[model samples]
Target: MEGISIYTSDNYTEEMGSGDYDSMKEPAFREENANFNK
Candidate 1:
């Protein structure tokens, strides 16, 4: 679910306050971004 894509680098973890629910959050982010670009 593109977890790595969203959660990777770019200081995402720090901004997220230590990877809170990364497994759950990344999928929704992936879908939104995927639709956004395409």
Candidate 2:
């Protein structure tokens, strides 16, 4: 997963909160972003 890519300084973490990038949350967030973007 592009955890680091999408979870960088500019991502949902800004709204959700920073450094919240665990394997569990980030994978879902990243996948959800893809689904939303699509």
Candidate 3:
């Protein structure tokens, strides 16, 4: 599930968007993200 990571300034919400960018880099986020996309 490795993908290219791009840099963007996009922000839709403070809690889930820009503010959580760094957190998304963690392994925990991959599961959360996959579940979210489902």
Candidate 4:
């Protein structure tokens, strides 16, 4: 498997989408979900 690259950030205005899931991941897959609060 060609390892996947990650990009976890708030959606940019240019990339403002209307629904969940973007490109190949969630629209709000940020680091905050997996850390800090954990």
How well does each candidate superpose onto the true structure, as a TM-score? 0.15, 0.12, 0.14, 0.16
Error in Å for residue 32 of model 4? 38
- Model 1, range 1-38, lDDT digits (tens) per residue? 55545544454454335545564433454455545663
lDDT of 3 by residue, 1-38 (tens): 47577768577566544555365444664455555653
lDDT of 2 by residue, 1-38 (tens): 55545434443444445456564532454454555653
Q: Is candidate 3 or candidate 4 better by TM-score?
A: 4
When 1 and 2 are scored with TM-score, the better candidate is 1
Clashing pairs in 3: none
| Candidate 1 vs. true structure, TM-score | 0.15
- Weakest lDDT window of 10 consecutive positions for candidate 1: 23-32
**Model 4, 1-38: lDDT tens per residue?**
57587767656568556756555654575564666663
Candidate 4, number of clashes: 0
Model 4 accuracy (lDDT, Cα)? 0.62
Cα RMSD, each candidate: 10.5, 11.2, 9.9, 12.9
TM-score for candidate 4: 0.16
Among these predictions, the greatest lDDT belongs to: 4
| lDDT (C-alpha) at residue 17 in model 4 | 67
Name the candidate, 1 or 3, with the larger TM-score value. 1
